[PDB]
Structure 1
Amino acid sequence: LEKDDKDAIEEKFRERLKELVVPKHVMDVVDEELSKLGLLDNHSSEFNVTRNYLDWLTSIPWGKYSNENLDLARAQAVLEEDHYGMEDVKKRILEFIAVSQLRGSTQGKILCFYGPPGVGKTSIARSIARALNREYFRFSVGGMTDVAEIKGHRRTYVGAMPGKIIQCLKKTKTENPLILIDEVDKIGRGYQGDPSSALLELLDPEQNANFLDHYLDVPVDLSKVLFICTANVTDTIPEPLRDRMEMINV
Structure 2
Amino acid sequence: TSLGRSIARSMNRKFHRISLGGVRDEAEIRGHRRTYIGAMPGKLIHAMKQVGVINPVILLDEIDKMSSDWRGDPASAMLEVLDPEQNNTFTDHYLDVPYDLSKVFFITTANTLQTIPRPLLDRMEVIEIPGYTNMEKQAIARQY
| TM-score normalised by L of structure 1 | 0.46
Deviations 1:103-149 (A, max 9, x none): xxxxxxxxxxxxxxxxxxx3211222122111111111112112223
Give RMSD over aligned pairs: 2.0
1:150 pairs with one of 7, 11, 29:
29
1:217 aligns with 2:90: no
Alpha-carbon distance in structure 2 between the residues aligned to 1:162 and 1:231: 24
Task: Return 5+ residue gaps in structure 2 as ranges.
Answer: 130-144
Tell me what 2:126 maps to.
Answer: 247
* 1:72-125 Cα distance to aligned partner (Å, 9 max, x none): xxxxxxxxxxxxxxxxxxxxxxxxxxxxxxxxxxxxxxxxxxxxxxxxxx3211
The CA distance in 1 between the partners of 2:65 and 2:91, in whole Å, is 25
Given the alignment of the two structures, is residue 136 of structure 1 paired with residue 15 of structure 2, yes or no?
Answer: yes
- The structure with more radius of gyration: 1
How far did 1:180 drift?
A: 0.7
Report the CA distance shift for 1:247/1:172 in structure 2 as closer, same or farther (over 3 A). Answer: same
- Gap regions ≥5 residues in structure 1: 1-121
Are 2:86 and 1:200 aligned? no
**3-state SS of paired residue (2:122):** helix
Q: 1:184 aligns with which of 38, 52, 63?
A: 63
Contact 2:84 2:103 in 1 (8 A): no
Secondary structure at the residue paired with 2:110? coil
Alignment of 1:9-24 (within 5 A): none
Task: Indicate the structure with greater helix content.
Answer: 1
**Pairing of 1:84-163 with structure 2 (within 5 A):** 122-163=1-42
Q: Is the contact made by 1:169 and 1:177 (CA closer than 8 Å) also made in structure 2?
A: no
State the percentage of identical aligned residues.
62
Q: Distance in 2 between matches of 1:175 and 1:205?
A: 12
Residue identity opposite 2:69 in structure 1: Y
Decide whether the 8 Å contact of 1:150 with 1:199 is kept in 2: no
Which letter maps to 1:209? N
For residue 68 of structure 2, what is the amino acid of its counterpart? G
Deviation at 1:245, TM superposition (A): 3.4
Q: Contact (CA 8 Å) 2:113, 2:126: kept in 1 or not? A: no
The match for 1:50 is none
- Give the structure with the higher percent strand: 2
Change (3 A) 1:220 1:145: same
Partner SS for 1:243: coil
Equivalent pairs, count? 128
- Residues 77, 91 of structure 2: 8 Å contact kept: no
Q: 1:204, 1:244 within 8 Å by CA — same for their partners in 2?
A: no
Q: Hey, what's the Cα distance between the residues in 1 that align with 2:83 and 2:119?
A: 10
Partner of 2:108: 229
Describe the SS at the equivalent of 2:45.
Answer: helix
State the 4+ residue runs in structure 1 displaced beyond 4 angstroms.
none
Quote the Cα distance in structure 2 between the aligned partners of 1:160 and 1:153.
Answer: 6
* TM-score with structure 2 setting the length: 0.76
- Quote the offset at 1:172 in angstroms: 1.3
Q: C-alpha deviations, 1:212-250, integer Å up to 9, x for none?
A: 312111121111111111222321223330113333333
